[PDB]
Design a binder for this molecule. Structure first.
Ligand code: BGC
Ligand code: BGC
Ligand code: MG
Ligand code: MG
Lengths: 724, 724
């Protein structure tokens, strides 16, 4: 509908209707739900919600199905005075029913198209079941694998996170201006604004603190990129940002997000985050919480009641302007209008059962392809991998048969539809003997069984990993190790004298030195989703060739955290020249280097790269064009991730030794050669100074081209002169 | 001498003389040294120093003795054109020849007079050996025990650190305006400006980053308190402060230190930190390092050559004002004048040998007393301690005979003068059988010998600990554990069936859960210094009653870091009510609480505390007076540390759940009662807001009175109304 009519609607709403429009509830709080109706009476009572509230609520989250949505929306519209439909939102993080790899794995793909396809399939399915908005992409920069929510991020690099966040937004939304016509696309919601991933000591919901300059330099760019690409909503974070809970942080939300970033859509609280400013000690009671959160521009309170119970009194007493409320309401109505809800409140579903669009073989093949892009081959000593299809496999461990391979933040996908490692392997390999063990134990009976199977077979596929519940939200591990029984299993298997491949399933970087050293090959599958066992067999058999690269460093030990590629030099860097000397930046007990670095991953192929001759000088404002020729010099088709880093050698702020500024994943047949070109604009040379200006300074830069943050050629360019 | 004559010197100095005045050298770079003459030629060549530089250098650091000083100063004044004596500086950190407990141990004393006496003795001795300045107190707030330099700090509380820093400054300097007359006192130098203890991942020299507000709130107060108390010098830090190396950080050193803190003394670089701004990538070469360091107000370059080789070109070329150089020179000459050097360049020694003042029995008694104040009794199950003098003791382990008990940052103290654990115990206990073991090994032979000694005796004193070189500068440990052989030893000794007291020697919090569980008693001696074994024997025997309290939290495990008592609440605190629920701030694998908290320590005595009735309301600007009656209800004399904490329940910044704001250690005979009063001024109620203003806001505060950060009674005070 026309904008004037949307505005007319705000004019016609009562104060009570406006206030309720800013409330989001679970589906079973509404009449006409078709699941958990037993919960309705008591929770309404505990939250002090009445029909006047629920008949005028703005939004539902976590609808259980299309029939839930239709039932709720049909009942709601029979009673709603002005005919303002509900907007339905859901956590579609890495797939709906067809589950794709967890986002940290998708990070390791270094493949924008993989990420866009994942998001496109997710929306196809989730719109089929009645959802209008997804709480994705998650764009929190992560340096601390203790935090269980690293699985939701694409990792430690702001540029990669930025690029892949744009890819996700494009996949969910397509052309954002046509979300009222394209009903298999859905609105995206960027989360969590901001810097949630810096939770101190890896502890869920904990303190975040960093300088404003560092917040701009590293922690804000991915949110900004997704906002500029047209993400429709933004969601607040649970943490303080410089001492003030994000939800009520007016500088963050009004000055940065709405002002500088020019975001003009709905700002939704994380769950209960409005009320939880009271816990943080920055609001005395729900009245202050409501006032401060509305002052900060939070439009939609997720499942708490501060707005609903307090806004009327604040407005009547003159402590809050009703204009702020009208602004929030208008943004809510505009979101609904963008989704087409005033013309079709059922968004395509009313006369059109799209059941058939869910969990198709096509979508499954795309989830398999995502998993084979995202896995990272970490070790392969003496070409153990790929295995011949006639290889006799002893498949042993806790991940041999476990159906828990879909990942955390899987709200809608079902394990009954997933493919476990055994099932995947048996489709490919004729001879497999299986010995399942428990996740946290290694018995004498297990050892006897394992030794028998290994003796019978020729190679060991040792399937290790995490239960998904050991990560995700409020899954913090102080020690980033598998259960000790799993390391003991690996040590035992090594003694048996056969070659061992470890296929590792997990949601965070772990201490894997003991695994790498106890086996011949190490394949990081992360959690691949629905097709996990087929992803695993295809990579092991060579039907697919591993091409993922680490998007997050793997520490030597827990106590190395945080360790990351884009670090500062210090005043006393350890060099090859001074290594062993006491008075330099080092640990007495471990190397400075992570066990594996950003951008690292192995392949069954071998590749050669060469960079075309670069200018020795550049003007300010001028782009650097980097041309790279890559050849596959092996007999095996595969993909390589070409990475380009920049370093600012001297600056008014100490700058990182490298920062990723371009990447492309290149597919090459045996012997095939291709040429790729990158443009590093002057923005790539730029950074935030002590006064928070984004600046470009003349001086020397180094340009690194290669296949990891370590395996690079280095070039120098002197920037100066005039500004183009 | 008169100020006009000091200014006349500056006026008469040549540019080259003024430049060299800003250089500090090791003693053996000067003619007339009496030690390490073999190091002189090679190092002069490598630094490209000539006679013209050395005959005009401003200062010596690390003279080896009084005769070293006299020889150097005598030669220097024979050749110096204007008669500007050298100033001699040294690292006197926790004692000179009489070595006192390491600073982290002194923090555990919670005893201002102990710290002042330590610094007084240090100065008595250090002046007797010709030193004018010490590079102490170290006031870096520490929350990360991976960092080896925690041993230099008094711990994780800014108030404690502030109070003890002031005590050290008072001890070293006495009345600062009389340093020209009181020649057994010396100048103090506050270090390291600023925030060095926040080194990321515990890694030496590594990146520090925090918000400006947090810098002011927590990281600057102790420096400021020492500066306001009259500390003569400040030394720069190695780290970046918000991306700019402290040494060339103009905002930090010009705006904050000289401006806001009103410091007008010598700012000296940490060792090589001027040259090292190059390594950090914020200066391209020595010429820039010199320019930016002088712009930032660094007066004295410690053992690098940027100033000496580059200032003349910078000033001649008009890139740097000669007036900044004149300001630095005037500060150097004012220090020298403050120390009386223009009247007596030998500061009391030329005709007065003060060897009689070094390592006196009185000074040894003071060090023992400091050691018994600073040790922390952590466990004492079943009243194992104190031991009877007739107790038959098997003394076993790596600290049984090791002479390494003086601590890190012990430049001048000698192990031959220290008292080891065996020697200390045999002065007190008639029957001791000793089995020494290695720091990192546990052999079969050791086990046989330990088993035999334990069989023979009745109780085991298991002496474990760190070598001092595993801490101090560039002694970072990623895992804060003793060598695993020592945990294996404690496990072994537990099997032998006799009661075990573990006496732990160390420079950092460690993972001690496995020790506490493998023994009946656990006594944290840190490194007590020269009287170590007598301290140990006196506490074990009950001649002294433990009275130290932790000034730094002991983590559950390395991955809990950082963990500290003055933490924020979060939006989802774990409470006794919700413990067990998933969606709260917790770890899956460990408690939120540290293994032992701030302000914890046991005693042989038992105490009862009662707080007198408190007002329910307070005006803004008004002090709260807290009166506490304490009684020793046991038959054993002892000391207790009464602690007072304040909480700001609601604020415009999320405030810590508690902050220490007063403490007093109270000595009580059996059955004795005393009353102590504390004034919490309005400053105790104040904090830095989002604008960096220091404010007091009306509202609710809680007042906690007790004997640790956990063992407290709680009161509420509503602050509001008018101001004063
Ligand atoms: O410990 C203070 C200084 O001592 C010197 O001898 C070392 O060479 C320096 O690297 C160190 O910072
Ligand atoms: O995980 C998202 C949210 O889900 C809800 O079911 C929980 O009650 C919240 O504590 C949580 O933040
Ligand atoms: Mg530069
Ligand atoms: Mg308050």
């Amino acid at each position: 509908m026309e904008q004037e009519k949307v505005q007319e609607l705000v004019s016609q709403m009562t104060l009570d209707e406006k206030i309720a429009q800013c409330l989001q509830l679970s589906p079973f709080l509404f009449k006409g739900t078709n699941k958990n109706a037993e919960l309705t009476g008591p929770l309404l009572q505990e939250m002090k919600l009445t029909d006047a509230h629920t008949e005028n609520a703005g939004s539902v989250l976590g609808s259980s199905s299309a029939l839930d949505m239709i039932g709720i929306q049909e009942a709601y519209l029979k009673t709603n005075r002005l005919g303002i439909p509900l907007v339905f939102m859901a956590d579609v993080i890495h797939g709906y029913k067809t589950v794709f790899p967890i986002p940290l794995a998708l990070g390791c793909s270094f493949d924008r198209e993989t990420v866009r396809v994942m998001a496109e399939v997710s929306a196809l399915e989730a719109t089929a079941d009645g959802h209008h908005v997804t709480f994705s992409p998650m764009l929190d920069l992560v340096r601390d694998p203790r935090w269980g929510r690293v699985m939701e991020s694409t990792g430690e690099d702001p540029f990669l996170n930025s690029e892949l966040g744009k890819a996700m937004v494009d996949g969910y939304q397509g052309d954002a201006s046509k979300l009222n016509e394209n009903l298999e696309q859905m609105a995206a919601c960027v989360k969590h604004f901001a810097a949630y991933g810096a939770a101190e000591a890896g502890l869920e919901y904990n303190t975040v603190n960093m300088s404003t300059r560092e917040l701009y330099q590293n922690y804000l760019p991915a949110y900004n990129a997704a906002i500029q690409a047209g993400a429709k909503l933004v969601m607040t974070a649970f943490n303080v940002v410089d001492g003030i809970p994000a939800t009520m942080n007016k500088w963050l939300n009004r000055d940065v997000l709405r002002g500088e970033m020019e975001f003009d859509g709905v700002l939704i609280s994380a769950w209960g985050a409005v009320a939880e400013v009271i816990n943080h000690g920055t609001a005395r009671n729900p009245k202050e919480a409501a006032q401060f959160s509305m002052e900060a521009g939070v439009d939609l309170e997720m499942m708490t009641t501060c707005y609903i119970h307090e806004l009327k009194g604040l407005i009547e007493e003159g402590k809050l302007s009703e204009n702020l409320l009208d602004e929030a309401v208008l943004r809510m109505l505009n979101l609904k209008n963008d989704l087409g809800l005033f013309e079709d409140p059922y968004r395509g579903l009313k006369n059109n059962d799209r059941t058939k669009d869910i969990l198709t073989d096509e979508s499954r093949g795309k989830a398999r392809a995502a998993g084979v892009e995202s896995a990272v081959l970490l070790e392969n000593k003496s070409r153990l991998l790929p295995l011949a299809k006639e290889a006799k496999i002893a498949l042993v461990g806790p991940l041999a048969t476990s159906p828990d391979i879909l990942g955390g933040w899987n709200v809608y996908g079902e394990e009954k539809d997933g493919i476990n490692v055994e099932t995947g392997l048996r489709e490919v390999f004729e001879t497999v003997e299986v010995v399942s063990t428990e996740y946290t134990e290694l018995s004498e009976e297990d050892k006897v069984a394992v030794k028998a199977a290994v003796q019978n077979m020729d190679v060991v596929v040792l399937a290790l990993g995490e239960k998904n519940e050991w990560g995700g939200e409020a899954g913090s591990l102080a020690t980033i190790r598998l259960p000790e029984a799993q390391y003991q299993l690996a040590k035992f298997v090594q003694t048996l004298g056969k070659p061992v491949v470890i296929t590792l399933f997990n949601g965070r970087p772990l201490e894997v030195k003991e695994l790498a050293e106890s086996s011949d090959a190490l394949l990081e599958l992360w959690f691949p989703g629905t097709e996990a066992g087929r992803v695993t067999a295809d990579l092991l058999s060579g039907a697919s060739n591993p091409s993922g690269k680490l998007s997050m460093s793997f520490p030597q030990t827990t106590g190395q955290i945080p360790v990351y590629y884009n670090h500062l030099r210090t005043g006393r860097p350890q060099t090859p020249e001074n290594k062993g000397e006491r008075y330099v930046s080092h640990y007495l007990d471990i190397p400075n280097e992570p066990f594996y670095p950003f951008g690292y991953g192995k392949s069954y192929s071998e590749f050669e790269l060469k960079t075309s001759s670069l200018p020795k000088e550049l003007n300010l404002g001028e782009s650097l064009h980097v041309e790279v020729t890559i050849k596959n010099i092996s007999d095996i088709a595969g993909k390589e991730v070409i990475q380009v880093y920049l370093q600012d050698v001297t600056a008014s702020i100490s700058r990182p030794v490298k920062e990723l500024k371009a990447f492309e994943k290149v597919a090459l047949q045996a012997g095939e050669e291709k040429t790729v070109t990158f443009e590093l604009t002057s923005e790539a040379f730029s950074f935030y100074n002590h006064q928070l200006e984004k600046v470009q300074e003349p001086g020397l830069h180094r340009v690194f081209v290669g296949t990891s943050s370590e395996d690079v050629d280095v070039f120098e360019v002197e920037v100066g002169g005039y500004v183009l």
